[PDB]
Write a protein that binds this ligand. Structure first.
Ligand SMILES: Nc1ncnc2c1ncn2[C@@H]1O[C@H](COP(=O)(O)OP(=O)(O)O)[C@@H](O)[C@H]1O
Ligand SMILES: Nc1ncnc2c1ncn2[C@@H]1O[C@H](COP(=O)(O)OP(=O)(O)O)[C@@H](O)[C@H]1O
Ligand SMILES: Nc1ncnc2c1ncn2[C@@H]1O[C@H](COP(=O)(O)OP(=O)(O)O)[C@@H](O)[C@H]1O
Ligand SMILES: [Mg+2]
Ligand SMILES: [Mg+2]
Ligand SMILES: [Mg+2]
Ligand SMILES: [Mg+2]
Ligand SMILES: [Mg+2]
Lengths: 198, 529, 149, 527, 529
C-alpha cells in the first residue's frame, strides 16, 4: 500500500541511538588529545586542493575536519563559541565533555532517567562556578608595574604550549605595549599583522 | 501456469501509475493504521518529562526542537491521512499556538477507539453522530470548570506566574528566568486599551556565554557598523531618511550638455557647493545621527563627518519602519530638512560589541516606550533556536490570556472530569449512540496515560487513583511530577494553569479532523510527477 | 492456481492455505499449525486460525501498557485450563449403537460443504466405510487406519 | 497483497465479470457449428498441419485459449465426449446461456443461493418431464438407420452421410449378439490414401497393415487355414551368460549347424501339421505370428507354400479369433487340427511402399473392419471422427430402451413446463425458474439463426403452435415453418441429454459459488 | 493520443502469435487471391511451348525441369490453400502421373470465377450445387467423345505412335527417337495376360555425347568393378548368395580353445582344407560367376581366382532381387552349391568402360526377358534428369493406356466441346444454379487461352475460330502449333491423342479440391515454430 513517510528515512530507538552517539563523540576526543600540554605536538590537515594546514589550536583542527555526524557537531559549536568569547581553552572543554559522556555511559546503559542526569550536571556546574568565583582571589589596588608584571606573566603562561615557546619572554613585552596602546575600547582591528618572507 | 486478466469495466481503463482503493479494508483501515503509526512517533515528546528530537531535512540543516509543529513541518509526509492531521496541527498553531501534540494524540485515540467500533459493526454515520454529540456535550460542560481568573495584566509578579506552566513544559529546569524575562518584555511594551501585537517582540541570537548571561533591552539592536567616525552620542536626534544618502538625479535617461570652458570648470564647484549647503541645512535643525536606507556617497560622508554627523546604513525594508515606530519618527523620501514633529528623540546611541560581534544598541531610559528586544546568549544554535521558540510560545500564551482571562486546571484533572461527566451523561442516552459516547469518553484518558509513560510510572494505577479522587469530591487534583512514586497532587495550590479558549479550539479542531477522516470512504490517487 | 498449471477449486480451510506462498515467519507458523490441525483431527481448520488471530489481536491492548509477557502467558494458560475444565464438565455422552444419531451428526457436520443436496447418500456411504474400516486383530488393540479405503 | 507483492488477486465483482465475459466469448465463438447448416473451420498447427473438422470438442481443444474457466469447460466437454458421444457444443452453449441469465439477475441485486435453488428445481422438473415424456420402442433396423442418419447429417453432405450410416448399421448388426453389452475395440478403422471418399464400404473380416516379406510366396489363395499364434521364431539367447568353445573348423561348423535346431523343431512340427491338414495341392495355410520371424524360417515356410506374417499388434489376436474362430495358442504342445481357422479369400494389395492384407469371405464373423478412403489426411480424420460419433450414437440408442425426438420440441416443452411450474414454487425461486426456462430455449434460437430465418418470430410461432396442440412440434431447417419432430425422422438420445443437463447444472452451481480467483504461487525466476 | 482497446472476449483471449479471420474478405477472398497468384506462376509452362524453370532449393541444388510436380514440390509454400492444392496435385500424380498443371489452372479459374460469383450476391451452397451438377454432366458426356482406341499393345510401330503426343509436350523437337526407345523397352518387358509393372524400368546416367548416342539394353548394369582377375566369360552360370563369401561363425560370442602343439598346428591346416573343399564343391557344380552381397575375404578371393571364378560384389539389397528376377534364379541364405534348379540362365557377362566409367553389363541374347535398362547419355545433369523424368512420364502413360485403351482427342477440342455442351445444357435449368453452370462452362476456356498465349498468338480469335468450327459440324479439330497464323487443324489426322481416364480423374480431383476450398469461411492459425 501507500507508505507513511518518504522511502529512505533512517530511524532509531533511544538506548542504542545514545550508545552510538557516545561512541561517535568518543572518537572526536582523540583528535585533540595530544595537543594540550606544553610537551604536546600539533596536527597536519590536507584539503582537496593540496594545501597544508598546520595549527596547534583545536578550533582550526575541528574546522578543517569537516564532520558530517549530527552528534559530533556539538563539539565544533562549543569550540567556536569558546574561541569567539575568550579564545583560549578550546580543547579542554571538549575533553571535559568527552569525560562526562564516558562517565555517564554506564549510568545511562544501566537505566537512569536523563532528567536526573541533566539536573545533576546543572547543579555541579553551578557549584563549580560558585566555588571558582569564591576562590577567584582578586585585587582592588595595585602598583603601576604590578599590572604590567601580571600581564607579562599571563602572556608567558598563555604562550607556553605554543610554537614560540622558546621566545615567550620577548613577545610578552611586545603584546603588553600593543594592548596598552589600544585606546580604551580595545579595537582589535587596529593592530596590523604583516608577514614578510625572510 | 495460468494468468488471470483484469476486470472488463473499470480496472482496464484505470491507466497504469494510478491506484484505487474502493473497499473499506484497503482504505479506511489503511488510513487508521497510518494515523496510528504517525501518532506513535511523536507520543514520547508530549509532557515536560518528554525528550527532544533531532530531525534533519533535505537541506542538510539541523533542527533539534521539541514541539510537534516543527516536527510535523520538517517531516515531508506522503500520506493524506497524516497530511490532514498535519494541516490541522498547522491551523491550530496559527490560531492559538499551543495545542498541536494534544490535537494529534486526541485524533489518534479517537481513530483507534473508532476502528474497533467499525470492526464490531458500528457504521460511520452512527459513530460520527455520537462523536458530534459528545463533542457538543464537552463544549457545553467546559465553561463550567473555570474557578480561576487573571486579575491584573501589567503586574510583573503575576504574569510570570501564569506562563511558567507553559514554559516548564517546553524548557524543564531553567524556567523562572525565562518567565521573568517574558513578563518584563511584555510589561515594557504593554500599551493601553488592550490591542496587543505579536510583532512587537524582537529576538536576537548572539553566541556568548551561558543562559544566565542573557538580559532584556528596552529598544532595538542591529548587527551592522557605523559608516562615520562618530560613536558616542549623548542627546541623539535621529533623522531617518528613506531615500539613499546621495545626489538625486532624474528618472528619465538624461546627460549633461557643456560647451564653453566656464561650465566645465564650474560644474563640480557648484555641485560641491550645493552638497555642502544641503549638509549644513540638514545639520542646522539639530540632528545628531542620520539613519539612511540606501547607497551612500563619499562626498556626503565626508561632509557629515566634518560636521560630526553619525551615519547608519541599513537595508531590510522592515527594520527601518520598526526603528521609526520605536523612536516615533516618519520617513522622508527626499533630502529635505525635517520638521520638529518629524524628529526621532532617543536617549543613548553608541556602538559596542558583545561576544566578538559589533552591534548598535539603541537603549532608551524610558520605562514604557514602544517595542523591545530580547538578547539571547548561548553556545549552540539549536539551544538558541529552542529558546527563541519558547519565547514565542510564551508571547502567544500571553496574547491568548490577554484575549481571554479564563483559566482551567491543568495537568490532567480537567480531562478526567470531562470524561467522567460524559460517561455519567451517556448512561441515560438510549439507542446505539451510547457506545460512541463511552468511546469518546475513553479517549480523554490518553493524556494521563502519556504523562505517566513519559514520567516513568504505572499508567493504570495513576488513572485509577485519579478516578477515585474525582469520585471522592476533589476536582483540581492532577498527577505529581517531582515524585518517583505514582501519587496525586493538587493543581490549584501548585500553580499548573493553562488556557481555556486554546484547549477549546484544540478539541474543536481535533473533532473536526476526526469526522473529516471518518467521512472519507474510497481513495482515488494518480501517479507521482 | 498452482504453479504446475492446474485449477484448485475447493472450500476447505487447509487446501486453500497450502497453495499460498508467503514470506513472513508468522504466516509460515500459521500454515504449519493449520496443517498439523488438519492432520490431527481432520476438521476444524478455519476456526482455530480465526481464534488464534483474534487472541493475538486482543493481546496488543496490554502490550502497549508496559505489561510483561510472562504474566500474559500465565493468564493464557490459566484460561486454557479453565476452558478445558468447562468443556470436560459440559460433556454430553452419546450411544454408538444408534445409526440415526450418527447419520444426523454426519449430516450436520457436512452441511457446510457443497454436498448439502446429496448428504442423503453420502452419510450412509461414510457410515458403511467406517463400519467396514474398523477391524480387530490380535489382542486388545482396535486400530482404525485410513490406508485401506 | 501485503504478504505477497507479486500475487494477483481479484475480488467478487471482478471475478464474476471476468467469468461472464469468458462465457459470453466461448458461447459466441462456438455458435456456428450447431445444426447441419453450419460452417466448417480450418485449424493449422505450429508444424503446418491442416485439419478440417466440425466437432466441438476438437475445435475447443485446438483454439489456443489460456483461461481457467475455458480449461474447465474444455475438460467438461472432453469428459462428455469420451463418456457419452455427441454433446460438446450444446453443452457450452447452454452453460453460457445459463451464466448470462444468472448474471442478468445478479447485477440487479440478488443472491446466488436462491438462483442455485431455482436452477436445481428447474433441473429436477426437466428431468421428471423427460422421464415422463419418453416413449418406448423396439429399436428395429429402420430406427437405427434413421438415428445414424440424423447423427451423421451434421458432418458431411448427403451421399457420404448415408454411406457412413449404412456402414455403421451393418457393422453394428454384424457385431451384434443375443445378450451382454456391446463390446467395442472390435471394428478396425483403416485409412487408405487412394481413390476417392465415395468408395467407402464394409469388409466382413480383418484388414492388416502389413503383408508378406518373402518374394517367393503366394499372393492369392482360394482356400487356406488361419493359424493364430505368438511364439518366437527368431534366434533367442539364453537368460544366463553362456559361451561356445570349439577346436577346429569342423567343430565350429558342427556348433553352427546345431545352434539352429530349436526353431527347426517348430518348423518341422508346423510342416507336419500342414501336411496332415491339407495333403494335396488344393488348400493353403496362413500363419499369423505376433513376433518376428528369422529369414531361414521364412525361406523354409516359403519352400512349401506357406504365407506367414510377422510383427502384428496385440489387438488382432482377439479380432481374428472372433471372426474366423481359431485358437490363439502360445506353445506347440497340443497341436490339434481343431485349433485352426477357416478362410475364404486371402489376397494382398500394394499401394506404392506400404502393403495390406485383406481377409474376406468368412462363415460367421463377429468382428468386421471398416475401410476408410480419402485423398487427404484432414478428410480421412473427419470421416473417422464422424464414424466414431455415429457408432457412439448407435451404441447409446441400443443400450437404452427409449428414444427422444430431436429438433427443438423437447426444449420448448421443458420451457413450457417450467413456465407452468414457477407459480407453484415459493420464495424468490420464480426468477431462477424463469432464467432456467429462458436459457433452455437457446437451441432453437441458434438452429433458426444459422439457417437464415428470424429468431423471435420463429420462437413465437413455435410457442403458439405448441400451446394450441399436444404434439412435439419441432423446428424445420428448410422453410422455417413449424413441423413435427417425432414424425419425419429426427431423433436424439435420453441419457446423453440427461448427462448434458447434469453437467450444465453442476457447472452453473460451481460458477455461481466461486467469487475469488487468488493466485499465490512461485514465479520460479531463480538463475 | 487515444489508444483503442481490444474486444473483451475472444480478442483478449486470442493469445500472442495467433491470428483470426472471421469475415469473408480476410478469408475466402484471401485464399482465392493466393490460389490465383500460385496458378499464375506455373501458367506459362503448360503446353509444349512452355519454358523451363530454374528452381534452387535450400540444399544448394539445381532443378531445371519442365514438369510442374517437381516445381510445386520445390517451393515450400506456407499457405493452407496452396498446401491443399499441392497435396491434390501430388495425389493426381500418384494416381495417374500426367495432369498437374491442368488441374492447377482449372482450380485457379474456378476460384477466380467463384470470387465474382460471391461478389455479385450468390451464396456458396448454390454455387457448390451448380459446380457439382456441371461436373456430373461433364463426366456423363465424357465417354461420348471417344474417337480412337488402341488395337495392339505389343507392336513397336503402334505403341510409339501413342506416347509421342505425350512426349512431345515435354521434349519439343527430339521426341521420335525417345518414343521409339520407350516403345521398344516396353515391348521387350511386356509379358502376357496384361499385368504391366512400373518397377521393371531402369535408368542409367552415363556422361558422354548427346541424345543421339542413347541406346536401350535388354538386361541390367551396375556401376561397380570385378573383384577377381576374371575378365569376361561366354557361357557362365550366375550363383547368387545372400550370405557374405566367407566362413560362417556362431552368432553367440565364442572363442576357440586350442591345446598344445597339435591343435595349434592343425587348426589353420583344417580351416584351409575346409575352405578349399568348399571352393571346389562350389565350382564343381558348373558355376562360373558368383555374385555375393556381403564382405569377402582374401583367402576366398584367392581360391576363387585360382579356379577361374568371377566375383561380383554389390550392396544395394533391391539390386540383388532385381538381378535374381532378371535371370530367373533366387537367393540363398547359406553357402550351399546349387544342383540343377538354382543355376543361372545368362548369355554374356563382360566388363566395359564408357565415358571413363567402368560398368558391368549383363547383356542377354533373348529379345524378351524380365526387366531392361535404358542407357542415357548427355553432357549435363539437368538434361539427364529431364530425360529420365520424360521416360518415367512415358512409362506412366503407357501403363495408363494399358489399363484403359480408350483414347480421346487432345489439344484444345475436347475441353471446348465439353464447355459448349455444358453451356447448351445449362440454358434449360431454372433456379440459381444456372449461373454456376455457366461459370463452370467458362472455366474450360482457360486451357485454349493458355495454349494460345504460350504459342505466341492471340487467344480470343483462336477461341472464336474453334467455336465456329465446333458449331459448323466438326469435333476433332483443335488449335495449331507450327502455324504462325491463328488457324485451326484436324487433330485426328495429325495424331493428337490423350488418356481419357487420366483426364477424368484430373477433373474429378479438381472438382473435389474446388468444393473443399469453397466450404471453409474462417481460418484459425497459431504461431510458427
Ligand atoms: N508542571 C506540569 N506538571 C504536569 N503536567 C504538565 C506540567 N506542565 C505542562 N504539563 C502538561 O503538558 C501538556 C502540554 O504540553 P506541551 O506539549 O508543551 O503543549 P501542548 O498543549 O501544545 O501539547 C499539558 O496538557 C499539561 O497537562
Ligand atoms: N436434420 C435435422 N432436422 C432437425 N434438427 C436437426 C437435424 N440435424 C440436427 N438437428 C438439431 O441440431 C442440434 C445440434 O446437433 P449436432 O450439432 O449434430 O450435435 P449436438 O446436439 O451435440 O450439437 C441437435 O439438437 C438437433 O436437434
Ligand atoms: N502435339 C500436340 N498438339 C496439340 N496439343 C498438345 C500437343 N502436345 C501437348 N498438347 C497439349 O498440351 C497440354 C499440356 O500437356 P502436358 O504438359 O503433357 O500435361 P499437363 O496437361 O499436365 O500439362 C495438353 O492438354 C495437350 O492438350
Ligand atoms: Mg590555550
Ligand atoms: Mg506547549
Ligand atoms: Mg467443518
Ligand atoms: Mg453432432
Ligand atoms: Mg503431362
Amino acid at each position: 500500500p501507500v507508505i507513511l513517510l518518504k522511502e529512505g528515512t533512517d530511524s532509531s530507538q533511544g538506548i542504542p541511538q545514545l550508545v552510538s552517539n557516545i561512541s561517535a563523540c568518543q572518537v572526536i576526543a582523540e583528535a585533540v588529545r595530544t595537543t594540550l600540554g606544553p610537551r604536546g605536538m600539533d596536527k597536519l590537515i590536507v584539503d582537496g586542493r593540496g594545501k597544508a594546514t598546520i595549527s596547534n589550536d583545536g578550533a582550526t583542527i575541528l574546522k578543517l575536519l569537516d564532520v558530517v555526524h549530527p552528534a559530533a557537531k556539538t563539539l565544533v559549536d562549543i569550540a567556536k563559541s569558546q574561541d569567539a568569547e575568550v579564545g583560549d581553552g578550546t580543547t579542554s572543554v571538549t575533553l571535559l565533555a568527552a569525560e562526562f559522556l564516558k562517565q555517564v555511559k554506564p549510568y545511562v546503559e544501566e537505566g537512569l532517567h536523563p532528567q536526573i542526569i541533566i539536573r545533576a550536571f546543572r547543579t555541579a556546574t553551578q557549584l563549580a562556578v560558585n566555588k571558582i568565583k569564591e576562590i577567584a582571589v582578586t585585587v582592588k589596588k595595585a602598583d603601576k608595574v604590578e599590572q604590567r608584571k601580571l600581564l607579562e606573566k599571563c602572556a608567558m603562561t598563555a604562550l607556553s604550549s605554543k610554537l614560540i615557546s622558546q621566545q615567550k619572554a620577548f613577545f610578552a613585552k611586545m603584546v603588553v605595549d600593543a594592548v596598552m596602546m589600544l585606546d580604551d575600547l580595545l579595537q582589535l582591528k587596529m593592530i596590523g599583522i604583516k608577514k614578510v618572507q625572510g | 501456469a495460468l494468468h488471470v486478466p483484469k476486470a472488463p469495466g473499470f480496472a482496464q481503463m484505470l491507466k497504469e501509475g494510478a491506484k484505487h482503493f474502493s473497499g473499506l479494508e484497503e482504505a479506511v483501515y489503511r488510513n487508521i493504521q497510518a494515523c496510528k503509526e504517525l501518532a506513535q512517533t511523536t507520543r514520547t515528546a508530549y509532557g515536560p518529562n518528554g525528550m527532544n528530537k533531532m530531525v534533519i531535512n533535505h537541506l542538510e540543516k539541523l533542527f533539534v526542537t521539541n514541539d510537534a509543529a516543527t516536527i510535523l513541518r520538517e517531516l515531508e509526509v506522503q500520506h493524506p491521512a497524516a497530511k490532514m492531521i498535519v494541516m490541522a496541527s498547522h491551523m491550530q498553531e496559527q490560531e492559538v499556538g499551543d495545542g498541536t501534540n494534544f490535537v494529534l494524540v486526541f485524533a489518534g485515540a479517537l481513530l483507534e477507539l473508532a476502528e474497533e467500533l467499525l470492526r464490531i459493526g458500528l457504521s460511520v454515520s452512527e459513530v460520527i453522530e455520537g462523536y458530534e454529540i459528545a463533542c457538543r456535550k464537552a463544549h457545553e460542560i467546559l465553561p463550567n470548570l473555570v474557578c480561576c481568573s487573571a486579575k491584573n495584566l501589567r503586574d510583573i509578579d503575576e504574569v510570570s506566574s501564569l506562563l511558567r506552566t507553559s514554559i516548564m513544559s517546553k524548557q524543564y529546569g531553567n524556567e523562572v528566568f525565562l518567565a521573568k524575562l517574558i513578563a518584563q518584555a511584555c510589561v515594557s511594551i504593554f500599551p493601553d486599551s488592550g490591542h496587543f501585537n505579536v510583532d512587537n517582540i524582537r529576538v536576537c541570537k548572539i553566541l556568548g556565554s551561558g543562559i544566565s548571561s542573557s538580559s532584556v533591552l528596552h529598544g532595538m539592536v542591529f548587527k551592522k557598523e557605523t559608516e562615520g567616525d562618530v560613536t558616542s552620542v549623548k542627546d541623539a536626534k535621529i533623522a531617518v531618511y528613506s531615500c539613499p544618502f546621495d545626489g538625486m538625479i532624474t528618472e528619465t535617461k538624461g546627460t549633461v550638455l557643456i560647451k564653453t570652458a566656464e561650465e566645465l570648470m564650474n560644474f563640480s564647484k557648484g555641485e560641491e557647493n550645493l552638497m555642502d549647503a544641503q549638509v549644513k541645512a540638514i545639520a542646522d535643525t539639530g540632528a545628531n545621527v542620520v539613519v539612511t536606507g540606501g547607497k551612500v556617497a563619499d562626498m556626503a560622508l565626508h561632509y557629515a563627518n566634518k560636521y560630526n554627523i553619525m551615519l547608519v546604513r541599513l537595508n531590510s525594508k522592515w527594520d527601518l519602519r520598526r526603528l521609526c515606530k520605536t523612536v516615533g519618527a516618519t520617513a522622508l523620501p527626499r533630502l529635505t530638512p525635517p520638521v520638529l514633529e518629524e524628529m526621532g528623540h532617543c536617549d543613548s546611541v553608541y556602538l559596542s560589541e558583545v561576544g566578538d560581534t559589533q552591534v548598535v544598541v539603541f537603549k532608551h531610559e524610558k520605562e514604557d516606550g514602544a517595542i523591545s528586544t530580547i538578547v539571547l546568549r548561548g553556545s549552540t544554535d539549536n539551544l538558541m533556536d529552542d529558546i527563541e521558540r519558547a519565547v514565542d510560545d510564551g508571547v502567544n500564551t500571553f496574547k491568548v490570556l490577554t484575549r481571554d482571562k479564563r483559566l482551567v486546571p491543568g495537568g490532567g484533572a480537567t480531562e478526567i472530569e470531562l470524561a467522567k461527566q460524559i460517561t455519567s451523561y451517556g448512561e441515560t442516552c438510549p439507542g446505539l449512540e451510547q457506545y460512541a459516547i463511552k468511546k469518546f469518553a475513553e479517549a480523554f484518558e490518553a493524556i494521563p496515560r502519556a504523562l505517566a509513560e513519559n514520567s516513568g510510572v504505572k499508567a493504570n494505577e495513576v488513572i485509577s487513583k485519579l478516578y477515585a479522587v474525582h469520585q471522592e469530591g476533589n476536582k483540581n487534583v492532577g498527577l505529581d511530577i517531582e515524585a518517583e512514586v505514582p501519587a496525586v497532587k493538587d493543581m490549584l495550590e501548585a500553580g499548573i494553569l493553562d488556557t481555556y479558549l486554546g484547549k477549546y479550539w484544540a478539541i474543536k479542531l481535533a473533532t473536526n479532523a476526526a469526522v473529516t477522516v471518518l467521512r472519507v470512504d474510497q481513495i482515488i490517487m494518480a501517479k507521482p510527477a | 492456481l498452482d504453479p504446475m498449471g492446474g485449477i484448485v477449486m475447493t472450500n476447505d480451510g487447509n487446501a486453500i492455505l497450502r497453495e499460498i506462498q508467503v514470506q513472513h515467519p508468522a504466516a509460515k507458523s500459521m500454515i504449519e499449525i493449520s496443517r498439523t490441525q488438519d492432520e490431527e483431527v481432520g476438521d476444524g481448520t478455519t476456526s482455530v486460525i480465526i481464534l488464534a488471530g483474534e487472541m493475538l489481536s486482543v493481546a496488543e491492548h496490554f502490550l502497549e501498557q508496559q505489561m510483561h509477557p510472562t504474566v500474559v502467558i500465565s493468564a493464557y494458560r490459566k484460561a486454557l485450563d479453565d476452558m478445558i475444565s468447562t468443556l470436560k464438565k459440559i460433556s454430553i455422552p452419546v450411544d454408538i449403537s444408534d445409526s440415526d444419531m450418527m447419520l444426523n451428526i454426519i449430516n450436520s457436520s457436512i452441511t457446510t460443504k457443497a454436498i448439502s443436496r446429496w448428504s442423503s447418500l453420502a452419510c450412509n456411504i461414510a457410515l458403511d466405510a467406517v463400519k467396514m474400516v474398523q477391524f480387530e486383530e490380535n489382542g486388545r488393540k482396535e486400530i482404525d487406519i485410513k490406508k485401506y479405503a | 497483497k501485503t504478504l505477497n507483492p507479486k500475487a494477483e488477486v481479484a475480488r467478487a465483482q471482478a471475478a464474476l465479470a471476468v467469468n461472464i465475459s469468458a462465457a459470453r466469448g466461448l458461447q459466441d465463438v462456438l455458435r456456428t457449428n450447431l445444426g447441419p447448416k453450419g460452417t466448417m473451420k480450418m485449424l493449422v498447427s505450429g508444424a503446418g498441419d491442416i485439419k478440417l473438422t466440425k466437432d466441438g470438442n476438437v475445435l475447443l481443444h485446438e483454439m489456443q485459449i489460456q483461461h481457467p474457466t475455458a480449461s474447465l469447460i474444455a475438460k467438461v466437454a472432453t469428459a462428455q465426449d469420451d463418456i457419452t458421444g455427441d454433446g460438446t457444443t450444446s453443452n457450452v452453449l447452454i452453460i453460457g446461456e445459463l451464466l448470462k441469465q444468472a448474471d442478468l439477475y445478479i447485477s440487479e441485486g440478488l443472491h446466488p443461493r436462491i438462483i442455485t435453488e431455482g436452477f436445481e428445481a428447474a433441473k429436477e422438473k426437466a428431468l421428471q418431464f423427460l422421464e415422463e415424456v419418453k416413449v418406448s420402442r423396439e429399436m428395429d433396423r429402420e430406427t437405427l438407420i434413421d438415428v445414424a442418419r440424423t447423427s451423421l447429417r451434421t458432418k458431411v453432405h448427403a451421399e457420404l452421410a448415408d454411406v457412413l450410416t449404412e456402414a455403421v448399421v451393418d457393422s453394428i448388426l454384424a457385431i451384434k449378439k443375443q445378450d451382454e453389452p456391446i463390446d467395442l475395440f472390435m471394428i478396425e478403422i483403416m485409412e487408405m490414401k487412394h481413390k476417392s471418399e465415395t468408395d467407402t464400404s464394409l469388409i466382413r473380416g480383418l484388414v492388416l497393415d502389413h503383408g508378406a516379406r518373402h518374394p517367393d510366396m503366394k499372393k492369392r489363395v482360394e482356400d487356406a487355414y488361419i493359424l493364430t499364434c505368438n511364439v518366437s521364431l527368431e534366434y533367442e539367447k539364453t537368460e544366463v551368460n553362456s559361451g561356445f568353445f570349439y577346436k577346429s573348423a569342423e567343430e565350429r561348423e558342427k556348433l553352427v549347424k546345431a545352434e539352429r535346431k530349436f526353431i527347426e523343431d517348430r518348423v518341422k512340427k508346423i510342416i507336419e501339421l500342414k501336411r496332415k491338414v491339407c495333403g494335396d495341392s488344393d488348400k493353403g495355410f496362413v500363419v499369423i505370428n505376433q513376433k518376428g520371424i528369422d529369414p531361414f524360417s521364412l525361406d523354409a515356410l516359403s519352400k512349401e507354400g506357406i504365407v506367414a506374417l510377422r510383427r502384428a499388434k496385440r489387438r488382432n489376436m482377439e479380432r481374428l479369433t472372433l471372426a474366423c474362430g481359431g485358437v490363439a495358442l502360445n506353445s506347440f504342445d497340443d497341436l490339434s487340427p481343431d485349433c485352426l481357422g477357416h478362410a475364404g479369400l486371402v489376397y494382398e494389395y500394394t499401394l506404392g511402399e506400404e502393403k495390406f492384407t485383406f481377409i474376406e469371405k468368412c462363415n460367421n464373423p463377429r468382428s468386421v473392419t471398416l475401410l476408410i478412403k480419402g485423398p487427404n489426411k484432414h478428410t480421412l480424420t473427419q470421416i473417422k471422427d464422424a464414424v466414431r460419433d455415429g457408432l457412439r450414437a448407435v451404441k447409446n440408442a441400443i443400450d437404452d430402451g427409449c428414444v427422444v425426438p430431436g429438433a427443438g420440441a423437447v426444449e420448448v416443452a421443458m420451457a413450457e413446463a417450467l413456465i407452468k411450474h414457477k407459480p407453484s414454487v415459493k420464495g424468490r425461486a420464480q426468477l431462477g425458474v424463469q432464467a432456467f426456462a429462458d436459457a433452455l430455449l437457446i437451441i432453437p434460437k441458434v438452429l433458426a439463426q444459422n439457417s437464415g430465418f428470424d429468431l423471435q418470430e420463429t420462437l413465437v410461432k413455435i410457442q403458439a403452435e405448441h400451446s394450441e396442440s399436444g404434439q412435439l412440434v419441432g423446428v424445420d431447417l428448410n422453410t422455417g415453418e413449424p413441423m413435427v419432430a417425432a414424425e419425419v425422422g429426427v431423433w436424439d438420445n435420453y441419457c446423453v441429454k440427461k448427462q448434458l443437463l447434469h453437467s450444465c447444472t453442476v457447472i452453473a452451481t460451481n460458477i455461481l459459488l466461486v467469487d475469488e480467483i487468488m493466485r499465490a504461487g512461485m514465479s520460479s525466476l531463480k538463475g
